[PDB]
DNA sequence: CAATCGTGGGAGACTGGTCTCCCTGCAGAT
DNA sequence: ATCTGCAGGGTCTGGTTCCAGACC
DNA sequence: CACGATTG
């Protein structure tokens, strides 16, 4: 029936999935703070909540989610942000009734055939236009990519399959 | 007259105070999860928000929590865990209907006269013994010094005073 | 606005300065 | 079960008993 | 991935 898909970064997204074959997408709703005496961007936690509040996917929906793992390499604000998207997404979907299961990006990387491509958010994008031609065209851009991964996340959850 | 406090960490606390004076304080739950094939203790999400929703403390309740402020000395699993935590208890304490304040660490201490001692946590727990003279059976260890910190969070924003 | 690049970084409270503040993760001791 | 000490750290998944190769 | 930056 229904499936949710969240990728939980910054510029990601959540896409619902109907028992009927439509669906959705939205991008995650963000908000620009002062840390620092700097400005960064941060995921508007309370647009999020009301944003589960408002879906037809009914209590008991699975929502795949991706699991973080930063690179040793990236730095500690890296980290922290990964970290807390991760927390506040996770946090939000169990509180507004549905069941988390993180999902690893090498696993829907591997269902979908997409693992080690030069130019990997591209082929996100294309694979998803396939999945889901009603949204070839909030895949045009090249920051729709988190649209995709979503909507990728959505599409393994439910055992869909590439032509 | 309702203020809940959180401190966010692993071995922080959420302490609720009703407007007749009395005073709740529970420790954050926590499950063990393997990660990288050693076993960690991660916050419990679906038991913070069962928490949050057995409060009696009504909706718009304002709850003050810790700004997370890791040192950049800190490992970036550190960083990791104080954002994941913090935006697990955001997230958790927006959707139960209460209002989310953060408050550096810095600004409760003064308050209180804490700052600069050489036995912080064994300080909280006594001013939070003050403060709360029934939870003093509560503060009586040194692993109790989340429940002081919770339990001085709430009572700086419900302003009361050491005597 | 949309994209590309290179490296991995604190943050916060009382006209920039100064100063103080949190943890995690793992081992070892009782 | 409680405390202390000290340095700041990947994690995951197919494939086993430890690796290889992949990923944000 | 994030964070500052600079590119049309
Ligand atoms: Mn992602
Ligand atoms: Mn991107
Ligand atoms: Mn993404
Ligand atoms: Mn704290
Ligand atoms: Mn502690
Ligand atoms: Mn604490």
Same mark, same amino acid.
């Given at each position: %029936? ?11 997204? &959540?896409?619902? *999935? ?5 669906? /959705? ?7 620009? &703070? ?5 400005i960064?961007? #941060? ?5 999020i909540? /009301? *944003? ?5 996917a ?5 929502? +795949? &989610? ?20 991760? %927390? *506040? ?10 069941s ?5 990006? /090498?696993?829907?990387?591997? +269902?979908?055939?997409?693992? #080690? ?8 994008? /294309? ?19 988190? #649209? @995709?991964? @979503? ?13």
């Open positions: %029936g229904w499936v949710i898909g969240v990728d939980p970064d910054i510029g990601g997204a &959540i896409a619902v *999935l109907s028992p009927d074959g439509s669906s /959705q997408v939205f991008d995650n709703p963000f908000v620009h &703070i002062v840390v620092s005496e700097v960064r961007k #941060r995921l508007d936690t309370k647009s909540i /009301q *944003l589960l509040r408002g879906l037809d009914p209590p008991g929906t699975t929502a +795949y &989610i991706e699991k973080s793992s930063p690179f040793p390499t990236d730095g500690k604000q890296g980290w922290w942000s990964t970290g807390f998207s991760y %927390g *506040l997404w996770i946090a939000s979907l169990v509180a507004s009734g549905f988390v299961v993180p999902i690893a990006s /090498q696993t829907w990387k591997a +269902y979908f055939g997409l693992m #080690r491509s030069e130019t990997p958010a591209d082929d996100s994008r /294309q694979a998803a236009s396939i999945l889901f031609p009603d949204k070839d065209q909030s895949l045009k851009l090249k920051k729709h990519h988190g #649209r @995709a991964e @979503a909507l990728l996340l959505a599409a393994y959850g439910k055992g869909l399959v590439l032509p």
